[PDB]
């Protein structure tokens, strides 16, 4: 049809336009920068509590607590500083792929193959946590719920539709459809006005939360994308894929900058997370170990080999004081 | 050094850690049963034998509690979430016999079987095949050969040898006959005996797992 060839000519126009601005590689301009060196992180803690594979974790806003979800059916709110277990929430369905901890500390969201990421209310008068609300309406499988605030929650899905829910009325408001894949990760910008989503189309997209329309579309991966984190500045974001490479896209440059690839690496990527400054680009590889990355020099600076199964989730504190690379052997390890 | 009131917080951790273990033990008591099948192949017929997204079927039989996971409704990329089930005791299949002329969809089922038996995650989990709908299969075989979808077959049109042959044809896709064991029961409308096979098979695979953990086998 005419619309088809119009779509390819638009794609050619976009490619030529973004080729017209790529006049300097990031490594080319940062070649004269002193390297970070080597980053010897050691496992400061180990909470040998879980029994099944761990699929997600979200650090607290106050940089101390962290919620961790596992296939045993209980996501437990850790106290990273003192190894304690603040809470233990038995799920309705043991299948969980994501969990989020609200930036106010009084709400926990979690979901999986049950098409519902329930909202738990922690700081309640009734003494025990409970399902505050059961947000339902997706038709695939949720993969990353993230809290905008105590009322708005963005959710990924397996039915190509990221949704922005509204807790107090239950029913959602917008529906960020438009790419026909399987969204496996989300990432809120630091100003929380924009968020990016990674599906199995090998195409991460930058959505406007307020408007509801795809602001920008990024390509450059061949296989699926299942790990994305914003740069702390808020104008770049690194994507993790099964390609054994991590790519760093820019929002204002609208295109790829770096490809954190390694010939020795053949395993996929499960989760990616920058550092507080952004220099370090941590990433959870599928070969049972993490791997740091100098995000302006494209060469590694250490390996966090401390797990026996694949590391399936990461998180970096808002203070930048720690990471914790949760893996499938039921052990999170708070590196530093 | 010690803390002060935070030792009671540590006690709270212990007070739920113990409970965590007593739920973990209970989790080992339950038997997991991933349920696959073609589009309305036999899934409804096998779930109706005994009491949105995944619809878990909890039921018990002779002091053993089963969980069944009807994962057909997950209309998405299977390989993205199939690794969540690495640990399920048994992949209870269900493929209809009567679905052997429309779109040779058993070969599509073979592809599905090829995806799940040769899968990297399920390199140790048994596959309890269920070639149900015997009656309609007998009707459609009394008036049509198996060559309508699989020309290479050159046997007879009687039920028994052809059914055993296609059972062996399914079993030949294993390629790892030692670590696992692909069961199979040709059952439709067999009342409690179907469930009895399920209990027997899961007790067998649990005993095999225990023998492998202790090292006897």
């Amino acid at each position, epitope marked *: 049809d005419q619309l088809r060839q119009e779509a390819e000519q638009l794609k050619n126009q976009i490619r030529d336009a973004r080729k017209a601005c790529a006049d300097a590689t990031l490594s080319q301009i940062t070649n004269n920068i002193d390297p970070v060196g080597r980053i010897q992180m050691r496992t400061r803690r180990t909470l040998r509590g879980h029994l099944a594979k761990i699929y997600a974790m979200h650090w607290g806003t106050d940089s101390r*607590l962290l919620v961790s979800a596992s296939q045993d059916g209980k996501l437990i709110i850790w106290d990273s500083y003192t190894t304690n277990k*603040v809470h233990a929430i038995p799920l309705r369905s043991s299948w969980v792929m994501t969990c989020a901890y609200a930036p106010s500390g009084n709400y926990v969201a979690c979901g999986g193959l049950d098409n519902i990421c329930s909202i738990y209310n922690l700081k309640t008068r*009734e*003494g025990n946590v409970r399902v505050s609300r059961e947000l339902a309406g997706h038709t695939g499988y949720l993969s990353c719920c993230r809290f905008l605030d105590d009322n708005q929650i963005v959710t990924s899905s397996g039915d190509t539709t990221c949704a922005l829910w509204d807790i107090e009325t239950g029913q959602q408001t917008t529906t960020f459809t438009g790419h026909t894949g399987d969204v496996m990760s989300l990432s809120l910008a630091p100003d929380t006005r924009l968020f990016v989503s990674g599906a199995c189309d090998a195409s991460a997209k930058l959505w406007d939360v307020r408007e509801g329309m795809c602001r920008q579309t990024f390509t450059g991966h061949e296989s699926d994308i299942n790990a994305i984190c914003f740069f702390p500045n808020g104008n770049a974001f690194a994507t993790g894929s099964d390609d054994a490479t991590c790519r760093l896209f820019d929002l204002r440059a609208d295109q790829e900058l770096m490809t954190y690839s390694h010939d020795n690496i053949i395993c996929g990527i499960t989760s990616v997370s920058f550092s507080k400054s952004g220099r370090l680009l941590l990433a959870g590889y599928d070969d049972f170990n993490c791997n740091v990355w100098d995000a302006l020099k494209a060469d590694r600076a250490g390996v966090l080999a401390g797990h026996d199964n694949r590391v399936s989730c990461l998180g970096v504190t808002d203070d930048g004081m720690a990471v914790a690379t949760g893996s499938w052997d039921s052990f999170l390890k708070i590196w530093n | 050094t010690l*803390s002060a*009131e935070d030792k009671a*917080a540590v*006690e709270r951790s212990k*007070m739920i850690d113990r409970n965590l273990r007593e739920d973990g033990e209970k989790a080992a008591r339950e038997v997991k049963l991933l349920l696959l099948g073609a589009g309305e192949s036999g899934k409804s017929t096998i779930v109706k034998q005994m009491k949105t997204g995944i619809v878990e079927t909890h039921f018990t039989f002779k002091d053993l509690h089963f969980k069944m996971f009807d994962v057909g409704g997950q209309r998405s990329e299977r390989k993205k979430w199939i690794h969540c089930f690495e640990g399920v005791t048994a992949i209870i299949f269900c493929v209809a016999l009567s679905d052997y002329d429309l779109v040779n969809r058993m070969h599509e089922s073979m592809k599905l079987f090829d995806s799940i038996c040769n899968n990297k995650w399920f390199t140790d989990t048994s596959i309890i095949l269920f070639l149900n709908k015997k009656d309609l299969f007998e009707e459609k075989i009394k008036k049509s050969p198996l060559t309508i979808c699989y020309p290479e077959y050159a046997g007879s049109n009687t039920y028994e040898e052809a059914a055993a042959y296609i059972q062996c044809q399914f079993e030949d896709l294993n390629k790892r006959k030692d670590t696992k064991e692909i069961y199979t029961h040709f059952t439709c409308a067999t009342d409690t005996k179907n469930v009895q096979f399920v209990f027997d098979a899961v007790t067998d695979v649990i005993i095999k797992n225990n023998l492998k953990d202790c090292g006897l086998f």
Partner: single-chain antibody, 233 residues
Framework: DVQLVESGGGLVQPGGSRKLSCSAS????????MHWVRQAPEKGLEWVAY????????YYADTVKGRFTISRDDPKNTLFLQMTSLRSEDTAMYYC??????????????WGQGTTLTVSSSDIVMTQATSSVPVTPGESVSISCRSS???????????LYWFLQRPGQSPQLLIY???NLASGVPDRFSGSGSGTAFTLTISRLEAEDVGVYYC?????????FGAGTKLEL
């Protein structure tokens, strides 16, 4: 909502026995380290005995150790204190206090109505500043409370609390760990100070807030209250 009601009480014979019972409806009683507190009819509060969650730990005040005992009936949600050899100084009004201990938790959230018990005829001492402060609605109030030990633990949060016992009522928490606020009270209250020197600042006071404020610490058992400052008009 959360409800704590007691039983027993009245007048007894000195030296006898009395099982005081505290009911509990409306919360997860199984995971609440409960307390008991004495209130003599003419002076301030004093800690009786603490029971942990799941009965895994038991404490007592030094003056009552070896005379009482706490038993938890978790399936029926009832807390018993058995008193034996009651002397003339053991007459008071008794409150059963729920409390949950984790990171960011607020112990002493909700206090029972309390029951009276009338018999017939070292540790951190929390000193107050006065017994009455004449105030008017609208202005500010600055209660002060010194201590006798450095309440600033190594983890960096001083385990000092505050309360408010309005007349003919039961005291509820206002400030826990000297900076935080109890869920259900206005943000006009504000604690401050250093170790061994703590201050509460009631900003823009109005009526119905004229009860006694009991300075309390929680570093080490036996946790001890203060004499309280009964402000009036």
């Amino acid at each position: 909502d959360v409800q704590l009601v007691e039983s027993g009480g009245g007048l007894v014979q000195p030296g006898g026995s009395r099982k005081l019972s505290c009911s509990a409806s409306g919360f997860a009683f199984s995971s609440f380290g409960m307390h008991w507190v004495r209130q003599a009819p003419e002076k301030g509060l004093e800690w009786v005995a603490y029971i942990s969650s799941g009965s895994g730990t038991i404490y007592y005040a030094d003056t009552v150790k070896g005379r009482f005992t706490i038993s938890r009936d978790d399936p029926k949600n009832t807390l018993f204190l058995q008193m034996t050899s009651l002397r003339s100084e053991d007459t008071a009004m008794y409150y059963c206090v729920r409390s949950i201990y984790y990171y960011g938790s607020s112990p002493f959230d909700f206090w029972g109505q309390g029951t009276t018990l009338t018999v017939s005829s070292s540790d951190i001492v929390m000193t107050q500043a006065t017994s009455s402060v004449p105030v008017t609605p609208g202005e500010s109030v600055s209660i002060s409370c010194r201590s006798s030990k450095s309440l600033l633990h190594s983890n960096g949060n001083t385990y000092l609390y505050w309360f408010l016992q309005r007349p003919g009522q039961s005291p509820q928490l206002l400030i826990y760990r000297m900076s935080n606020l109890a869920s259900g009270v206005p943000d006009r209250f504000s604690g401050s100070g250093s170790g061994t020197a703590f201050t509460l600042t009631i900003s823009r006071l109005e009526a119905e807030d004229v009860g006694v404020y009991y300075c309390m610490q929680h570093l080490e058992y036996p946790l001890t209250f203060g004499a309280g400052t009964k402000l009036e008009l």
